[PDB]
Structures are given as C-alpha cells and as structure tokens.
Point group: C2
C-alpha cells in the first residue's frame, strides 16, 4: 500500500546523483577518509554526494522563501540556521553520517558554514546518573537533560547570536567538565543523536510540550537491522579496547586487561541489556517521524532511501 | 529575551495589506457574509487577507520546491495536498477562521481546490462515549478516535486518490450516522480542531507515535483570554438555541424549552466544567507548537500575530 514516504528507485537516485558535477578533489577525498578510515569512497560517490545534493534543494528552497518573507513582512533580515537532525540506534553510524554530511554540505557556496552538535553532550554527567541509579540507562530518556537540549535548538531558532552546548567524550565515557562548544549563527546546524525524534511522551518523568523536532527543518533516521547493529557495536567496542592497549587515559583501560573473548561477552551484554532495549523501547518507534529514512546493509552500504512525499 | 516567533502588533499586521495590493471581490463579500454574519469585512481585509497572502507564499515556495524535486523524481507521483491545521479553545473561532481562509485561498490559480475537514467528525459517537462514561469529556483526548484521525492525514500525505472522514453535527450533538465526507486530492486541505497540535503524550491511554502535526505543513493556533472565550461560547449557545425555536430535530430544542436565563446558566456550567478544563489541561499547552499564533481581543479583533522564524 501507499505510505507517506516515497522510496527512491534507481533512476530517480541516479538522476539526483548526476544532476551536478560534484566529484571531489584529492584533498577533499583525503579529509573524508580522515573522518572515518573505513568509509568507502564508492559510498561517498553513490550515496553521500547525492544525499547532500538532495538536502541542498531543501536548504536552498528555504533560503529563497526566507528572502521572499522578509520583503513581505518588513523584517530586519535576521539569520536563522537550517537544522538537520540525524537519529537512529546506537552504533548505526549517526556520527559518521553527520560528519560526512557536514563536510559535503560545506562545499555549496550558499551554505558554507555547517556546525555539528551531538545530543550526547546533553546527557546528565556520570555523577548525576550515579545519584539517580541510571548508570545502566545512559541514552535512555531519563539520562538526558532534555529541557536544556530543547532550549538549545529553540534559542538557535530564536536568532540568538551564540548558543552554547555541553560536550561529551566516548573515550572518557562522560560529559567534558569545561568542554562546552559555542556556535554562532551557522548556515546549517546538524544535530546528531538517538533522541532527536523523541517527544514529550518519551519523558513522562519530566514532560515537555514543544519538541526537538519543532525546531528542526529536516530529519534523517539512519536504520539498520538488529544483527548488523550488534556486530557494528561490538566491533567499535573492540576498536576502543585496542586503543586502550597504549592509551592510559582511555575509559576502556580495564577492558584491555580482559581476554578478547571476555571483552566480547561484555560488549555483547551492553548491547543486549542497554542499547538494544533502548532501541526497541525508545528509538525505533520514532522512526516514522523522520523526513527521510536511510537504510543500511552489509558493510554500511545504504540500500534504501525513503523520503516524505 | 528573543523568542522563536516574529511578533506583529495589529498596526504592523494590518500594514501588510498594502505591501502587496489586495481587495475583496463582490462575489467574495457575499460568500464571506454567508459564512458568518457577524464577521466584519474590515477585519477580513485587514487581518485575513494578509494571512492568506502569507500562506500563499508558504504554499507557493512548497510548490516550486516540488517542481524542482520532480526533475529527478519525475511527474508520475501522486498529488499531495498542502495541509494547514487550525487549533485553539472551543469557541475561539477556529471554524470561522478555517472557512474564511478556505474562501480566500481559493483566489490563487496555484491552489483553487481547498477542502475543509473538522476533527469533530473523529469524536467517538455519543453511544460510545456513554459506554465509557466520557459524555462529560467530549473534546478531551479520550473522546477521539485519534488513530483514525492520524490515518486520515497520513493517507492524504501518502497520495491516496481519495480519503474519507466521518462528519459531526453540532445541531444533533453527535457523529452523523452515514454522513461521511470524501475528499479527492485537493490543492489545500484545512484541518480544523482543538486537538491538531496534540501528540502521543496526550493519549497515554492508547498512544500513537506519529502525530497529526507530522502530516501538517502549517499550523495556526487562535488564542484569546478565557473571559472572552466564555462570552463567545455562551453567545454561540444562545444562537444555536434560537435556531432550535423552529427546529425540533436540534439537540438545542431541549434548551429552547427553557427560559433564556436558565439556558445561560446551563451553557455557563458546560463551559466551566468541560471546555475550560479541556482548554487548560489539553489545548493551551500545545500552543507553542504552532507555526503561527493569532491572538484575539474584544469583538474578535486580532491584536497580535506571532510567526515562527
Ligand atoms: N558509512 C560507514 N562506513 C563504514 N563504517 C561505518 C560507517 N558508518 C559507521 N561506521 C562504523 O560503524 C560504527 C558505528 O558508527 P558511529 O558513527 O560511531 O555510530 P553512532 O554515532 O550512530 O553511535 C563505527 O565503528 C564506525 O566506524
Ligand atoms: N472573526 C470573527 N468575527 C466575529 N465573530 C466570530 C469570529 N470568529 C468567531 N466568531 C464567533 O465566535 C463564536 C465561535 O466561533 P466558532 O468559529 O464556532 O469557534 P470554534 O470553531 O473555535 O468552536 C461563534 O459564535 C462565531 O460566530
Ligand atoms: C567505557 C564504557 C563502555 C560502555 C559503553 N556503554 C554503552 O554502550 C551503553 C550506553 N550507551 C552509550 O554509551 C551510547 O554510546 C550513548 C548513550 C552515549 C549514545 O551515543
Ligand atoms: C447539549 C448540546 C450542546 C452541548 C455543548 N457541549 C459542549 O460545549 C461540551 C463538549 N464540547 C463540544 O461539544 C465541542 O463543541 C467539541 C468538543 C465538539 C469541539 O468542537
């Protein structure tokens, strides 16, 4: 049956890809690989360049509408950033997807200044999660300072000249105590996190009545089947453990003393008991709120793009 | 502090009507007076013509974008209506606002076909409300078949060739037995109802995960102080009562049989015990989710307009 999404067929996707010259210079190819050494350049050419080009159509149409309204309404021409959000399971590739889209979108002269903010920064710090008995519930709704996350995007959509977000580090598994990131009226702000499509219903312990989505222009849910997500999560955990072999400041220091087999069992249980329950209860149900659903397969290659009609 | 809204006072909003020349036609005037005899044409020319022109800019921007996307999407796809929703208290003037905008938006050659659907039709019938003890809660979240309403707008946004809504009559105070209304791909659909800005959080008894708002391009919340809403509610009730003098099939015949004074007492209790409580608990908290908040003062005169930046 018909749904609110069109699924791109290969001729529509190819025409999008081929609509512009947008293959990259050598230096740009180098910086892309620096985002993630496992990123395929074939994916960049077949998937991420066209997806960034698709977004440009939306962003550009919005700038023109803004010019038309400022003339009509007689307003002072104030800059409002276009906000793109990126949702999905832990370990689906939200960060990589977001960093790739930041780099590619910045190539278009109409919107060169692209910022990226993760919702991880808005987690309550470990001290606080401890106080509340939620250290096993990191990434669940009760673990976020949701009111502050909404205020951040709300302030941006208010035309504030600067806004400040707290910052989180996966390497030390916590919010950086004085590591705040200040942004100033970018053309585009990408908001990356598992909870960007969540709403007041997900926070009954402390309700809010205006949602992140109410301040977001375009949202992407990055989707993938459970088994792939689990293996991606375990592999990434093993990578951090490896890092910890030589870096004493890694939070994975003690995991690097275990056998690999035991480390795998731990990661497996973290996935099963925390991130997978979080997916099923809180993340996956938000999926049909997205502007666009990008589905991933083997080796992270995107096999389906659905866009709201 | 700056907010997410451009704020216009009446002087500033009315000043828009010259910014782009516009005057009502002769046929339009007759249509308008047939919509509401108490509706001022000056109020139409000063407030609603500029509002309609605002909306045309949004709608036209969308149509232009759609044309551009069609370059790679192709033209085979189904026509999707632009959906405008109208929220606010019982008796604020949603229906009047909707019907006026339907009349005025028909002007433009870009979008001549304009349908109007009220969420009233998606109320559970009185028999069902009686089963569930909800008869004193008509208009509260539990009194709606919300799943059916989300599906209706979802279907429209899926490109169905036709979609069908149930219809309600204030005259018989119930859903009409076999009175369903079918719409066929209009250019604009106006959805009018107190609950159009509500979400799953408002339906904890039977939650939904994609909201009405997720299928709405542009939302208006019509706002006014409680004391005016009360007066407008009571006056309307007395007008329904008069209509029932010569109409014993009106549910208001029950009140036509009573003295005016006692009828006013009843109407006032219904306001205070049902609609005012609904406003405070369920309607007003959704106001900040609107694209535009239009505020009214004495005699329905608009004194402030707020539009999302
Ligand atoms: N497009 C991709 N190509 C190859 N590997 C990827 C891709 N996206 C993500 N990954 C890998 O999958 C894992 C999860 O990605 P990450 O961006 O950290 O997910 P998230 O931010 O959603 O938690 C990481 O190990 C990352 O290197
Ligand atoms: N713009 C207006 N000018 C004059 N009277 C109005 C206006 N809007 C609404 N009314 C009156 O106020 C009452 C409530 O309006 P209605 O459109 O029935 O409200 P709702 O649909 O919100 O319940 C009605 O008696 C209506 O005639
Ligand atoms: C050094 C400790 C390793 C355990 C990591 N915990 C988990 O994967 C379970 C909690 N989830 C997370 O830590 C997720 O990465 C987060 C909620 C921050 C979303 O990006
Ligand atoms: C006895 C016949 C008139 C009773 C009117 N009821 C009320 O005003 C309370 C219930 N609310 C309503 O009937 C509202 O009009 C509705 C919820 C349908 C929103 O358009």
């Amino acid at each position: 049956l018909m749904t609110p999404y069109l699924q791109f067929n290969r001729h529509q996707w190819a025409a999008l890809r081929d609509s512009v010259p947008m293959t990259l210079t050598e230096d740009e190819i180098t910086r892309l690989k620096g985002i993630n050494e496992d990123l395929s350049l074939e994916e960049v050419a077949e998937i991420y360049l066209p997806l960034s080009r698709l977004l440009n159509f939306y962003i550009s149409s919005n700038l023109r509408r803004q010019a038309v309204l400022e003339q009509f309404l007689g307003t002072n021409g104030q800059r409002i950033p276009y906000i793109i959000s990126i949702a999905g399971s832990v370990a689906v590739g939200k960060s990589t997807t977001a960093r790739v889209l930041q780099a590619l979108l910045s190539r278009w002269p109409e919107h060169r200044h692209v910022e990226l903010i993760t919702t991880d920064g808005f987690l309550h710090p470990n001290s606080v999660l401890k106080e509340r008995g939620l250290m096993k519930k990191k990434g669940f709704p009760q673990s976020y300072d949701m009111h502050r996350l909404v205020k951040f995007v709300s302030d941006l959509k208010s035309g504030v000249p600067q806004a400040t977000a707290p910052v989180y580090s996966h390497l030390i598994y916590d919010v950086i105590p004085d590591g705040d990131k200040t942004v100033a009226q970018p053309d585009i702000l990408i908001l990356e996190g598992l909870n960007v499509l969540q709403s007041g219903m997900d926070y009954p312990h402390d309700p809010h009545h205006v949602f992140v989505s109410d301040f977001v222009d375009f949202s992407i849910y990055v989707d993938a089947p459970e088994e792939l997500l689990k293996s991606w999560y375990i592999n990434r955990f093993l990578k951090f453990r490896e890092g910890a072999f030589t870096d004493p400041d890694s939070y994975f220091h003690n995991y690097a003393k275990l056998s690999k087999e035991e480390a795998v069992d731990i990661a497996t249980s973290l996935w099963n008991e925390i991130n997978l329950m979080n997916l099923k209860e809180n993340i996956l149900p938000t999926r049909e709120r997205a502007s666009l659903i990008m589905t991933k397969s083997a080796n992270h290659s995107v096999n389906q793009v659905r866009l709201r009609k």
